[PDB]
Amino acid sequence: SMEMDEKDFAADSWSLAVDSSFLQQHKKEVMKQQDVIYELIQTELHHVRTLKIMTRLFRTGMLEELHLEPGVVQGLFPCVDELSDIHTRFLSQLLERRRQALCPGSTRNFVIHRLGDLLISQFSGPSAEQMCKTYSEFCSRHSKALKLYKELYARDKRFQQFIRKVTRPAVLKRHGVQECILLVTQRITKYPLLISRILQHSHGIEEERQDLTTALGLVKELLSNVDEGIYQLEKGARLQEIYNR
Template identity: 50%
Template sequence: SMSKQLEAESWSRIIDSKFLKQQKKDVVKRQEVIYELMQTEFHHVRTLKIMSGVYSQGMMADLLFEQQMVEKLFPCLDELISIHSQFFQRILERKKESLVDKSEKNFLIKRIGDVLVNQFSGENAERLKKTYGKFCGQHNQSVNYFKDLYAKDKRFQAFVKKKMSSSVVRRLGIPECILLVTQRITKYPVLFQRILQCTKDNEVEQEDLAQSLSLVKDVIGAVDSKVASYEKKVRLNEIYTKTDSKSIMRMKSGQMFAKEDLKRKKLVRDGSVFLKNAAGRLKEVQAVLLTDILVFLQEKDQKYIFASLDQKSTVISLKKLIVREVAHEEKGLFLISMGMTDPEMVEVHASSKEERNSWIQIIQDTINTLNRD
């Protein structure tokens, strides 16, 4: 059976020893890595099916959980199963086509690159970017939601313990499942690279493998940036929630800026810095860089309010803003607003020189993007 075959440690263990002895070292190595790809893909599908068939179905059937609750734990599960079952089937078909001399078990896969290119390009790549973007983006929230449920809900706790003791689940808990799925696509580049390294004298196959390697890296890059923008959304929402609704700040242009205005923007970066006042004292604040504005918040009674700084505004428009290093002060930077009236200058200090440089870089990049648009 399929799972029996894939439980063997390696390709060499499945095939006849006589057949194995006839193969060159490179060929054996190549088949071993392809077998590892096949085996890990099989395990991945099995993990997804455990999440679906055992955990999600069980939560709805035994615990009468709503579908939305289950989807909070396991987003886009059906789509993931569909993507990976299809991929696994394609690899299996290739294995079947590669059986040698009417044998039932001896196989040599001469071409796999085309299957990989297909999986990581075009529509398939878009599906992967979308589903993994969402799944990995919600990874932390899913795990926190699980911990919360597990701590509060005794029936849920008993359900998880019971399921984990079954032979099918093999002690795979929910957070472990989630982590395994999150990590899967990051495992492909190494596998593809290794297949490529032991592929000799087949140029078309080498080209396909090299292409699949760059395609999968592209997918991973797209997923990473989706995850980053997802995390920034969550972070901006935390800042918004913590901001006092009574706090308000007049910008240099005369326009008022309030808590609600945070919601209309996208977060670029935030972090702790210091503002220097006229008396030369440094005050710790939270810098919040949005797409077209830089906001400084200070903590008061466990809430954020707009920071006070002499008579200056601490909500600074990026339009007509100039960023400069402070001479003889490696942690300092100047923000110079060149608006309609006299220029206004705010001195900001970071916790280190590296941190200062990275703030200058990102503020400058954000200003450049704004001017382009």
């Protein structure tokens, strides 16, 4: 997470991020819409940060410092590079829409009027197919990853010291290994709530209301597909047990 984006999203809301003289130029309904869009982008920035802690802090530290077998590290952090690729691209598109909307002479005053089209693009076509494939794989490997982590923490001294060392800083308080895995699993089910609330305050332009209505439907289709493609993998569960899920 770079300083520029952290500072742009430091405030608890859009209404506290923009200059108060700029805030006063907008209707109440536009303020409400912008506050929810700001929450979507700020939580996406945090989710991309969670994925960077998993790839750079945990995964790479285990490979370079503990010299763990790539297969063990893969079991602990399944699909992390694919997940990071999906969300860093989506975050880049969100931040570019904000950057283009900035008033000349300002690095904080903006209004995003056309989010719907960006959401339709993210949740349709090849990007939706990749999100569905990646989350169906990740969520099916969730239980296996937590069990593999617990076994390593309890039986390997160097692994326990590594974890305690890299998770000691206060900035990592909410981001232990298991915490990162659940943060990532829960991310996809936050989108409908955020989109529906943005839609609630986007009736001013009929085309925007229609675009968000389509986007909400696409996110729900994606979640139903992922939910239907999940089966918890279990190391040691013989094929005789797969049949009764």
